[PDB]
């Protein structure tokens, strides 16, 4: 899935996720979000199962973005946890957690949760 | 929080999270889980807000473990999303998502969710 | 504007489960749930709540409900809660995320909760 | 063993919110919820469900409930569902994770859900 996972992906929001799957199970690349307090590209890193089952299961993976770059800092980080599914129209199916820095009076409301699905089709 | 975040942490399960905060916002290190289909250490990587607010807020961060090493492969990955809180007894407060590789008939049940709190106190 | 009639009826989700719901005048949700997935058979009681006076700005209507997976046929020692919102219009949807908690011992509690997302559409 | 009396009563959580619940003989949960956090004032109706015949192996009792954040004082256009389990014994607890969904437009829907975890303990 190295060849499969590596590429430019787009989620249902129009966000762009450019990723490289390393030989050692590493994930690196960039994330540009179409939503929220975000501007231009952000660094990401993660990990994926570099030896998945050969039974029709997807390939487990996850990656993190801390929303700081040279343009903006949203004092937050998102983690996507999901799996890659290969074939004709390959998909990456994820759920995510977005934690913002918070005070102890704020902490109960510090984490947003959602789900993103990624394909390699360039939106229009 | 570079000096603060870097260290050996332990969660409520007795798991060991050894991490280094890089200068560029990188997180690296190892994770050994006291629970589940896991054995000895796993590679992790993530990101943290390397320039947090100076207002009493925590430092947003996240990191990923793919549960494959040279001992075992659980065909799953966990992402922890949370924040670091410094001071006398520093804590890392997280929520997490654990996705396993799944078939399309299995996918509805592929993701576990929980919360881990980390301190630098060595259990007994 | 209030969505008593928009919400009340029969819905299916993407697994083929059947959600039969009545939205009461006072914010109550009642009905039955038949799951096409998991350790479930036939219909289960559900109860929930919805915002009986939503904003007029085009926002959806917040709601939630619970199924405990015990009926006269089977008992899966677990409960799901769906949290999400009703969105009216030509193709109405109920968009949800859910938490499915199983009875667990202390040793198994870390793995006691599944998380997912279901979209419901209404049928005549 | 069934926990009608174990669950029924007044509980507080770690924010200082007050959860007043009656577990009915047929699996129903009813009561009120007063939150010490957020856009909330005084008591809100809740309804939920619990496993009325849990396993006898030491596992807790699965349950869930919903609050919609409209009462006679305030309407926060949102609903929380708590999913978790009751654990009896000398220090009984209700351990939950929760999803809090707010009414959202299509532009804001990606940010419409908060996630967290509450532990409840019972008071005389
Ligand atoms: O907007 C961002 C950074 C952009 C995240 C974009 C998200 S990532 C998941 C989804 N998928 C995408 O592709 N794009 C979106 N961060 C906010 C979070 C909420 N914030 C607070 C404020 C106060 N308290 C709590 C939280 C303020 C900062
Ligand atoms: O046990 C692991 C790997 C160890 C994860 C340990 C977890 S990480 C969050 C928590 N915090 C820790 O410190 N430790 C625990 N993975 C399972 C997941 C559930 N599995 C399935 C099987 C079939 N369908 C769906 C899921 C099988 C593989
Ligand atoms: O299968 C069911 C009951 C049917 C749930 C149906 C689910 S509701 C959300 C989704 N939307 C639907 O329409 N259908 C599915 N319960 C299992 C869950 C797995 N179980 C454990 C045990 C321990 N740890 C983790 C999980 C034990 C029992
Ligand atoms: O504050 C409340 C109602 C009070 C909820 C109390 C919560 S229940 C879970 C936790 N346990 C408790 O005991 N107390 C707290 N609702 C807000 C939430 C933030 N809101 C948005 C809007 C858009 N996107 C995301 C969030 C708008 C309205």
Author numbering:
A (entry chain A), B (entry chain A): 13 to 136
C (entry chain B), D (entry chain B): 11 to 134
From the paper:
We describe here the use of an artificial cofactor employing the well‐known biotin‐streptavidin system to catalyze a Baylis‐Hillman reaction. As protein host, we chose streptavidin, as it can be easily crystallized and thereby supports the design process. There are several examples using streptavidin as the host for these cofactors, since its natural ligand biotin binds strongly (K d∼10−15 M) and is easy to modify with catalysts at the carboxylic acid group. No enzyme is known to naturally catalyze the Baylis‐Hillman reaction, a very versatile and atom‐economic C−C bond forming reaction for the production of various functionalized compounds and intermediates of active pharmaceutical ingredients (APIs).
We chose a derivative of DMAP as the artificial cofactor due to its low steric demand, which will facilitate its inclusion into the protein scaffold. The protein host around the cofactor was rationally designed on the basis of high‐resolution crystal structures obtained after each variation of the amino acid sequence. The location of the catalyst is in a shallow cavity at the surface of the protein. The system was evolved through repeated cycles of mutagenesis, activity tests, and structure determination. According to the presented structures and calculations the catalytically active site is too shallow to undergo interactions with 1.
